[PDB]
Amino acid sequence: NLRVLLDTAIPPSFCDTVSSVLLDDFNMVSLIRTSPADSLATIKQDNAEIDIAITIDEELKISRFNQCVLGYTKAFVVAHPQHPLCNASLHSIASLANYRQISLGSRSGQHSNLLRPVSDKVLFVENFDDMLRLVEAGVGWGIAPHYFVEERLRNGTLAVLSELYEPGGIDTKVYCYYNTALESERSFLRFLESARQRLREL
Amino acid sequence: RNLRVLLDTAIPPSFCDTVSSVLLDDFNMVSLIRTSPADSLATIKQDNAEIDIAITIDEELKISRFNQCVLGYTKAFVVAHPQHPLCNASLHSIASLANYRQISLGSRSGQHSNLLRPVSDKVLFVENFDDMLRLVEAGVGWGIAPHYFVEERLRNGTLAVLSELYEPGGIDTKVYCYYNTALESERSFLRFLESARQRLRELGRQ
Ligand SMILES: Nc1cc(NCc2ccc(F)cc2)cc(C(F)(F)F)n1
Ligand SMILES: Nc1cc(NCc2ccc(F)cc2)cc(C(F)(F)F)n1
């Protein structure tokens, strides 16, 4: 009955708030997980037929889809603890362009201004697991969700560079692209109010 | 030592004052310049400007002599005359605004950041927010204004809000602090961030 997309930047607990509420208001609900780079691309395929998409990727004026914001989530710039930029007593973002970045997506296929790699030296990866596997190996630095790096930080396995730029992580809007048709449905509005309220708690 | 600072007209006054008190504490001399967010970044790009810090909502990465950080947040509303067509629609979307005229900031000539770029094809520009609301209240169109600038006109029913579906309670907008690269290695600048940020957080709670 309903098909929903959540990118891998949405913390898992939110994928839970979406499930419980939609299943309450609809008969059948389908869930798909994709990288934030592949989120908007997936819903644009005519054969996809995806009704809702919850992602951080920004892109205004999408056919058949309207946009709104559900809340926020945090993301950190991370690098191997012994990475050079960690040891730099003073941290800056202007300098990161000079080091290799482990980013998402592919070279072919445009990246939104949000996920576009900053560095000239870039190494792409399919998911967040592969990014950290290389970053922990000191290959480079990357931008990951809070929940995806919460443990590796607690255990000193990984460092943070974003504390000067935005302490406590870098707030990222969480957009909800909803098929324009759903706008006239009492069930959908009930989903937003609840989904947003639950998302605030974090 | 001497500091010259720019704050755009989207920064609420309590936000501006909170920044002022901290700069005067950590620096000897401080000067303030106020501009619309559309002209904020443009002003510091002029070499003759000689502006050391610029606090604005405008986005632009890779600025010469300037680095960027986040200082805090502020709220913004889409507003229109209460009897505006879109008001009668109990539920609004952003795809529909493109067909109505927008009262925006900036100039017609001169590139617009992706943030402040007007959304509608029919647009009418204004230099400051006062002129924007003057036209919006006259029903000429809709606009994007800071929370503090329209809080009064909303309480008095003089003006309506269209953004409650998009982002209830206002549209959170990051407030960046563009700082001359030189300040990065100055103990005064770091104390200013640490203090200004802490005070702005406590303030945001209130
Ligand atoms: N590329 C990217 C950007 C994100 N936020 C915007 C941002 C841009 C620059 C910066 F330094 C920090 C954050 C979040 C993620 C994700 F991994 F969390 F999904 N990735
Ligand atoms: N143009 C503009 C954009 C702002 N935020 C980005 C944004 C864009 C669309 C939207 F619906 C909500 C927010 C804030 C302001 C200001 F007046 F508050 F400064 N102006």
Curated annotation (Swiss-Prot), chain B:
Source organism, top-level taxon: Bacteria
GO annotation, cellular component aspect: extracellular region; plasma membrane
Listed GO MF terms: DNA binding; DNA-binding transcription factor activity
Predominant cellular place of this UniProt entry's protein: membrane
Activity: how regulated: Both 3,4-dihydroxy-2-heptylquinoline (PQS) and its precursor 4-hydroxy-2-heptylquinoline (HHQ) function as ligands and promote MvfR DNA-binding activity leading to transcriptional activation.
Keywords, sorted A to Z: Cell inner membrane, Cell membrane, DNA-binding, Membrane, Secreted, Transcription, Transcription regulation, Virulence
One example of a Gene Ontology biological process annotation: regulation of transmembrane transport
Cell compartment(s), UniProt: Cell inner membrane; Secreted
Function text: Transcription regulator that plays a critical role in virulence by positively regulating the expression of multiple quorum sensing (QS)-regulated virulence factors, genes involved in protein secretion, translation, response to oxidative stress and the phnAB operon. At the stationary phase, negatively autoregulates its function through cleavage and translocation to the extracellular space.
Family designation: Belongs to the LysR transcriptional regulatory family.
Assembly description: Forms homooligomers.
Protein name: Multiple virulence factor regulator MvfR
Residue span relative to the full protein: 93 to 298 of 332
